[PDB]
């Protein structure tokens, strides 16, 4: 019966994970479209005040929320951000990718459970039960990263993006991004020469990207940088396959650790 509306995927799962069958949860941003820039339509705005609660990640993430809450009211859906209580981090422009930390993730699950139990105090034990059980999985997940990081002597991983800033900090890891580096078009002669030398003094083995690397790129990097390319994705979205496959936060996050391994445990 409880109706909750969420922004992008990770917010959706956390919520549903604690609510399960006791509530109808949906996601405004379909898992296959950039959430960062996504902008709501009048229809979406309606469904928000239409629901019992609206869950979002951070005002620095879904930058359209603050405007939405104002142009709506309180009698309608009760807004609730999961990043509430998280000291954020060095992004003015803050870094909203906190859910990419199994620890901060737990926090969000707590922050959401709160508003959930409040809104529907009857099913209190239920929501509470599920919540604890997910925080467990999340903690079981945290052990892995915390174990692999200890057994790792690399402590640093090169990337093309930088959404993994909170995952690094949580495990004394260093996320070193590169200049003009895209998974689509290969780097410029000037950039490549810059990255190339950086790999000579860091014995760089793998380079991660937001999505799969194209032929050109994946190839050039091999010969030129003499390195490979791995994914390491932000649970910002899910491929149609993963959806039908069920692969979620814990699943896709485990994938992310694997890739890391092929660099940390060298
Ligand atoms: Mn992002």
Swiss-Prot record:
Membrane topology, record value: Lipid-anchor
GO cellular component: membrane raft; plasma membrane
A Gene Ontology molecular function term of the record: metal ion binding
Main localization, broad class: membrane
Family: Belongs to the bacterial solute-binding protein 9 family.
Assembly: The complex is composed of two ATP-binding proteins (ZnuC), two transmembrane proteins (ZnuB) and a solute-binding protein (ZnuA).
PANTHER family, per database record: HIGH-AFFINITY ZINC UPTAKE SYSTEM PROTEIN ZNUA (PTHR42953:SF3), HIGH-AFFINITY ZINC UPTAKE SYSTEM PROTEIN ZNUA-RELATED (PTHR42953)
UniProt function note: Part of the ATP-binding cassette (ABC) transport system ZnuABC involved in zinc import. Binds zinc with high affinity and specificity and delivers it to the membrane permease for translocation into the cytoplasm. ZnuABC-mediated zinc transport is required for comF expression and competence development.
Name of the protein in question: High-affinity zinc uptake system protein ZnuA
